[PDB]
Amino acid sequence: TVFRQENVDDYYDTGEELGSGQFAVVKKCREKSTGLQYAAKFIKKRRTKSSRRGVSREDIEREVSILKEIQHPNVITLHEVYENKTDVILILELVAGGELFDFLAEKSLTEEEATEFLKQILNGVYYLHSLQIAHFDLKPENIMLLDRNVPKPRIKIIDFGLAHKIDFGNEFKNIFGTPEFVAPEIVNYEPLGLEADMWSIGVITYILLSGASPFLGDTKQETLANVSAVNYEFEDEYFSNTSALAKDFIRRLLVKDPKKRMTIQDSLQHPWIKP
Numbered sequence: 001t002v003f004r005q006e007n008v009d010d011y012y013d014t015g016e017e018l019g020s021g022q023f024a025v026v027k028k029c030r031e032k033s034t035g036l037q038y039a040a041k042f043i044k045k046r047r048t049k050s051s052r053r054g055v056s057r058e059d060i061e062r063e064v065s066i067l068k069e070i071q072h073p074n075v076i077t078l079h080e081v082y083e084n085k086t087d088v089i090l091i092l093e094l095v096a097g098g099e100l101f102d103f104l105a106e107k108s109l110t111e112e113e114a115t116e117f118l119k120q121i122l123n124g125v126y127y128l129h130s131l132q133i134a135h136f137d138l139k140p141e142n143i144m145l146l147d148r149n150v151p152k153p154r155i156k157i158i159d160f161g162l163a164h165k166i167d168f169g170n171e172f173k174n175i176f177g178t179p180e181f182v183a184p185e186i187v188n189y190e191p192l193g194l195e196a197d198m199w200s201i202g203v204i205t206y207i208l209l210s211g212a213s214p215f216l217g218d219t220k221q222e223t224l225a226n227v228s229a230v231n232y233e234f235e236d237e238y239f240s241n242t243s244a245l246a247k248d249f250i251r252r253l254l255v256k257d258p259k260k261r262m263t264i265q266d267s268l269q270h271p272w273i274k275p
């Protein structure tokens with residue numbers, strides 16, 4: 001599938017850089033014809049078939065195809081796609097309130113504050129999983145706010161770079177997400193489905209309530225070993241005034257066997273969440 005090959009700079013003006021990763025940089029932008037503001041994600045293309053730098057066209061097209069399907073208040077939406085010899089440029093909805101992570105470092109949240117964010121995350125993931133889309137990269141860095149200055153901001157899931165359609169219940173590919181947040185089946189290179197996202201939500205919830213990462217070791221291999229062994233506990237110093245039901249919610253997500261893990265629908269009916 002081909003994208004718009006006119007020069008993006010003839011239609012948009014770029015501004016402040018919002019972030020940069022291994023093969024992508026995100027810049028605030030403004031469409032000349034409407035004055036509307038977006039985030040332009042420049043993804044570096046692979047320049048030879050056998051190279052390991054840049055993103056393969058198969059991977060770029062998959063992310064674009066997934067973004068084109070989704071429209072939900074808690075998920076980023078795609079406006080336009082351009083390309084040239086060096087980059088594919090996704091013109092994405094502007095989410096300017098910063099990461100849930102950076103907003104986390106400023107505060108540990110109360111259970112009402114945590115559940116207010118978490119309910120929006122669960123709503124967005126319920127939408128995705130209803131479409132058989134696994135995100136595969138849920139972590140605080142990929143949870144951003146629209147306006148961080150209100151007592152209860154609205155969040156949006158971003159970064160569909162690892163997302164996959166799961167039309168056979170599982171997909172057998174390597175997902176190189178970040179160790180602290182990936183499920184045991186990712187660590188062990190096993191078939192992957194929607195369940196992996198639910199584990200990631202359990203990790204996010206643990207951090208939201210405590211400010212601490214449940215599996216984090218001193219090295220990436222330690223973290224991955226801890227994940228595979230389900231080597232975590234609720235430290236009383238961090239959880240002493242956290243409700244048992246909040247702990248129960250986490251405990252039913254941080255489950256090694258994906259079949260025994262709470263699903264997205266389970267998580268919405270769990271007594272900690274269900275109104």
Ligand SMILES: COc1cc(/C=C/c2cc(O)cc(O)c2)ccc1O
Pocket residue numbers: 018019020021026038039041076092093094095096099158159
């Ligand atoms: C903040 O740090 C980072 C943010 C982003 C992405 C920001 C962003 C992404 C979108 O898809 C839409 C948007 O409005 C903003 C990428 C790498 C980073 O390191």
